Design a protein around this ligand. Structure first.
Ligand SMILES: Cc1cn([C@H]2C[C@H](O)[C@@H](COP(=O)(O)OP(=O)(O)OP(=O)(O)O)O2)c(=O)[nH]c1=O
Ligand SMILES: Cc1cn([C@H]2C[C@H](O)[C@@H](COP(=O)(O)OP(=O)(O)OP(=O)(O)O)O2)c(=O)[nH]c1=O
Ligand SMILES: Cc1cn([C@H]2C[C@H](O)[C@@H](COP(=O)(O)OP(=O)(O)OP(=O)(O)O)O2)c(=O)[nH]c1=O
Ligand SMILES: Cc1cn([C@H]2C[C@H](O)[C@@H](COP(=O)(O)OP(=O)(O)OP(=O)(O)O)O2)c(=O)[nH]c1=O
Ligand SMILES: Cc1cn([C@H]2C[C@H](O)[C@@H](COP(=O)(O)OP(=O)(O)OP(=O)(O)O)O2)c(=O)[nH]c1=O
Ligand SMILES: [Mg+2]
Ligand SMILES: [Mg+2]
Ligand SMILES: [Mg+2]
Ligand SMILES: [Mg+2]
Ligand SMILES: [Mg+2]
Lengths: 255, 259, 271, 276, 274, 271
DNA sequence: TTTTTTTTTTTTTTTT
């Protein structure tokens, strides 16, 4: 609250898992920590699932920790083909000839799935508790929560109690609310902390909020800005940096 | 359990990867979004009179003659006979439902009828989820068109979640048409205003539980209102969005041709 | 089941295809939109006091004498006696209600009953003396009288957003199930910047009160404009805003009022 | 049912066009040449700026319609109480300004001329006043039309009945009040004058400094110009008394525009016709 | 309910012999075309931000309280109670009290503080208010229970803190409080920003449509008085008074000129000729 | 809640038994008479013309030289940055502009001699970066017992009219009946035509951007002008725009800016 | 005992 001037005697004289791409994130929020609930809030088609899938790939090969996915947005094979194409630096699911040309398919399969690292998913709290106890998962990702006031808040309190009981890194993605006046978030508007559907617990029981903004109907729709909106451990919020998508490969890279 | 490890999944991916349907007119659509694919939900949104039903009816003609795929219509906006007379006139290069003399001059009616309806391609429609499940199971329909959803907040959201679950369970191409919202300040969409993704009635889940959004713009009270512009707003597969191309209507014939 | 195969539809199309009602005055209308057709919903718009009821009254007059079709008026805005007197004055070429030296002159000459059965001698016109009750009354007009044209004077006083949406869907379902020609008249909304509509401002398709459902479930929209406090408030403009069946829109023509008589007649005006 | 056929409506029309009609205005000639008076079952609305004479002209009209024409006039004035709007009519009848002079008030207290001026004006039951929820107001107006049998009813300052009522959205309340009031006026067939205000202009001159007022300047909603039969606006510039009349919408006739010029007399309070 | 106009003979006479205009001070030009203030009379007083609203209002409250016997109730919300009380005492003693620490230190020692206090507050003609629905209730308790004649409010924008509906409901409640009670009600409001031109604080003549908050404020007010002064010009203490609206008399325009005295705080009637 | 004039016999006598002087220039105190309990002071200039430097200098003068508890709420930067700014301003150096100067003071042990001379007397308090701010300022006023509270860069806290009007109303209600001097730093609106604020435009009172309620609840308004592009970039001008207490507006004096210690001195420039 | 869309009307400000 109120900080006295006597507690600045030495401070004037004055981590966890790291994020891949846009290096002003782990410079700013000091990476992810155990027991946290990270929210990734952006508009439609802004690259939420792509960013969290890149994070999941960089936390399953360079980190080696057991990663449990909850992709209720698409099937379990397409999200694996996206991982294989991302890892192999080549846009896989959107090129027609290469998908039958490479079938060395076992060579590209086993190089990234030789371990028992990744655990995909086709009640949900019991499934995540099983993924946490019987499998040793350290990163749990949930992509779509809007299908899973009072029932939203009870679900969020139950997820927060599960996270406090376990100590697992948890990344949950939800959507934005429809702007009522002016332009939209998809065309150059910064995301506020108010812009959240469902209820108001998304900015209360979470620990950090990451937003991505790009002008989709513009001259360069592949040049995002990343914004931190909340961070209980640091307080450093605002602009992180800029990334490009690199449409040949699909890796989000800062520049 | 419902857990699936990444190790025991080499078969299910191999049988999965072992473009899809194309769009006719303004060929910078399948140059941009690479045409339609399976299991999708496609939204076609424009203003009143902009040419939504004309575009989807031309697409339904072009997917039932050269493709031969089973097409299931749901034209809740109009009757079941006018939507067939428009297909007959469009296939026969003649503005049929507007010329009174030719409608009685041709009656060669069966000659124009059998050439396009000799197959079991098209299945029309005069609870709705059970009807669409029947049209998908007992008929083999690969394309399902729904002309109007606003006559069918939570009542739209639960309906869209159930439609997306049905599309996920079946793997059917599904096109759904809804309208634009009311603009508050400035010009209207009917006089040359570009469309943002905000312009959707009902709620905001329409842009979140879909896969692509296609919009048309034409200056109706202008000098040449027969020159549409097509805009792609969203594409989860590619990301390529923006102005695709132009189509002229060719008022004598009725075919949208790219020029 | 409600599925229909396209193969088993050869006969129902043949009995279906086996122009419609023309419009009177400003002959660029029926050249452009080709008149009304059975099973439509028509919108007529203008500013306040610009003559929407005046324009639809001439059409109800010309559709009852030259056509012979059953016409059902729904004058929610006024009484039945006043619109009956205005129809009599509009047919007999004489401004009736707006002249008191003649309203007592024709009742003593005995030719009032001559002018009465000259236009009301048939069973053409059916007036309405004022939601679900209105729908039941229009259904009884359609079934129990065989009406071809049903005119609704004013829709804004029916609502005493979702209640406008449900009403418009129900009216479209009624007019499609019975196939009756249905005309609906509404007003415009207050513009925020610039001039008002009454001094010659052209009307866009946004300017519709209540909600935006008035243009998404209607087949054609006709707007009429006239510079009221101008050089002359007689030369009116007619604009087609939307048409599903024909498509061609824009300015149709130019009419004058003929203040001595009151007939909207087309006149020569290029620009 | 209500499906009245056009054939079985003969004698009704014979008893409609034979009878009412008329009830001319005062102060100007061009007003009656365009609007052709006030008729039973209509709505005539008069607007001005702030403090421009939308009450003086109407009380001057209510003096003429209650004395020289015998019609029972009911004044629902809500700006002032019944003690002042009945006192100003006496002075306007006697061609003076009674409230604006403390000499003549004490003089008519002394000599007894107040009783002569009271019983000369109110010798016949022609003026019915009302003192100040929207429910009981229409009930008292229905009591004026049914029990008292009023022929002219003047409702002044409709802005006070939309602002003293607790409503979230004001536009629907104005619309519902206007359609219920027009339903009352059409069912009863009584002449009903309703007085409302104007709103703030966006830029340019102000309405109290000579701005030519248009029809879209009505304050509160757009239901005020859609359900009225006649709209008359008054415009002057503070020649601080030269007031002109503008017909904005005539539904009966078609002649609208500049009707004429009036001059307000600072001594008597009458709206005399001008020459210009 | 409704009444007939022939049962009013016993009250129209009773209103005819009751109502008396309370004369303004500082300028005779205001009282020439307004004839004062009566029972049931809402007077709006406005000028630019810092041009002398509360000073002229405080002078009017001082002259109607200690010289005319009217019981005056103030509801000053800009300042505290002791600050406006000290300013009333210093204004009545023709000095500038709170702007001088030496005089405030001097008058507490020689015992003339009570000499200045009891000469004003001995008759008990003034009442003060110490800081939406409870405010009108306390004003009703001030009117009925205490028996005050002229109620003065200051800085209406606190009570409204959508603003247009709130200020319209508030103006309707204050008009209903003023009418059918017989109480003078003085209301102070501010001015919105001019779009183009110069500022009101630099000498622009103020029009009628500068009253911020709604358009309903000048519709339910009976008499509107505006002040102006050019503090950046050659003569920064020569104010002008403009009567914008007068429902009773109908004469609007320039009233006169007043000169403000920097040493006594009494703005007096000047003799400037435009 | 209503108190009559008879109960104020000893309260007014309690009120008679002091303005905190403005340092840096004596031309301000000639026409402002300091600042009392409940004296809202608005301080503004152009974009980067030294609002934070002048207000931090006045807080440094009021804190360690006059014995007043000073509470800052700098939202432009965090706690340690403005702490380094206070220490480097008191010790007459330019601390955050040379890395050797930050390194020299810690290698010789004189860094602890600068903390204890400033923050050892408990006369300073800082705040770490909308209704949650007022509840903490209330605990700073009541619990800690401070006298001069400063808030900077109001655009962080704040349709940008209703929010700033409610904020200014709540701050005025907090500063009234408390006995606290609350200084608020704001900005100016952008110039549309003419010269800019970085060139020496003569400022008016209606330049407070966001609303018009910032000059209606402020008690003393001070504006600074610095011509960084002209001949003298180190000369500032102080203009009083509004004084409720006295009423004297215009140029107060002249001060010269320094690029050696960070301070700015009282000058005697001639116009 | 709570979050999101649609819509007509009155005011106070905002940019490149
Ligand atoms: C972020 C981004 C995506 N794209 C393209 C490629 C992506 O596969 C496609 C969409 O990105 P996705 O990350 O797949 O979007 P999403 O699944 O998170 O959306 P939602 O959950 O709201 O339905 O758009 C770009 O072209 N440039 C970009 O910067
Ligand atoms: C698309 C288009 C239509 N038209 C004409 C001919 C069409 O039959 C008519 C309307 O076309 P429709 O395709 O029927 O219009 P719509 O379905 O989008 O509108 P709604 O459902 O809201 O009523 O307009 C053109 O002239 N040029 C064009 O580009
Ligand atoms: C169309 C037209 C009408 N008029 C005048 C003469 C008629 O007596 C008068 C009647 O018009 P109305 O038909 O009553 O106008 P309206 O119904 O559109 O307006 P409202 O919303 O108030 O119902 O219009 C002209 O003068 N010139 C014209 O061209
Ligand atoms: C018309 C007119 C009136 N007057 C005087 C006569 C009256 O005393 C006063 C008009 O009083 P009102 O007519 O009662 O005021 P108003 O109705 O115009 O406005 P509102 O009720 O909304 O406040 O002005 C003139 O001096 N010159 C004029 O030209
Ligand atoms: C009347 C007058 C006062 N003054 C001085 C003494 C006044 O107390 C002071 C103006 O303050 P106020 O008299 O209080 O004026 P105000 O009500 O318009 O301001 P606010 O809303 O902010 O409270 O300035 C002048 O300089 N010139 C003048 O003409
Ligand atoms: Mg996604
Ligand atoms: Mg359609
Ligand atoms: Mg009409
Ligand atoms: Mg009046
Ligand atoms: Mg003041």
């Amino acid at each position: 609250g109120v900080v006295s001037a006597l507690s600045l005697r030495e401070r004037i004289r004055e981590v966890g898992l790291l994020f891949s791409g846009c290096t002003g994130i782990n410079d700013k929020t000091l990476g992810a920590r155990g027991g946290e609930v990270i929210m990734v809030t952006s508009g439609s088609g802004m690259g939420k699932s792509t960013f969290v899938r890149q994070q999941a790939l960089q936390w399953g090969t360079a980190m080696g920790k057991k990663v449990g996915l909850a992709m209720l947005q698409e099937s379990v094979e397409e999200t694996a083909e996206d991982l294989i194409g991302l890892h192999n630096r080549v846009r896989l699911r959107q090129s027609d000839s290469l998908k039958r040309e490479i079938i060395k398919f076992d060579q590209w399969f086993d190089e990234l799935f030789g371990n028992d690292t990744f655990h995909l998913y086709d009640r949900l709290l019991a499934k995540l508790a099983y993924m946490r106890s019987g499998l040793g998962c350290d990163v749990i990702i949930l992509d779509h929560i809007s299908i899973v006031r009072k029932m939203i808040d009870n679900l969020m309190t139950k997820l927060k109690g599960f996270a406090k009981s376990t100590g697992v890194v948890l990344v949950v993605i939800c959507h934005l609310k429809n702007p009522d006046k002016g332009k939209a978030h998809e065309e150059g508007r910064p995301v506020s902390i108010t812009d959240l559907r469902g209820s108001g617990a998304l900015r209360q029981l979470s620990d950090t909020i990451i937003a991505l903004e790009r002008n989709q109907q513009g001259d360069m729709p592949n040049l995002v800005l990343v914004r931190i909106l909340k961070c209980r451990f640091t307080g450093d919020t605002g602009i992180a940096g800029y990334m490009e998508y690199n449409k040949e490969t699909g890796w989000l890279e800062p520049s």
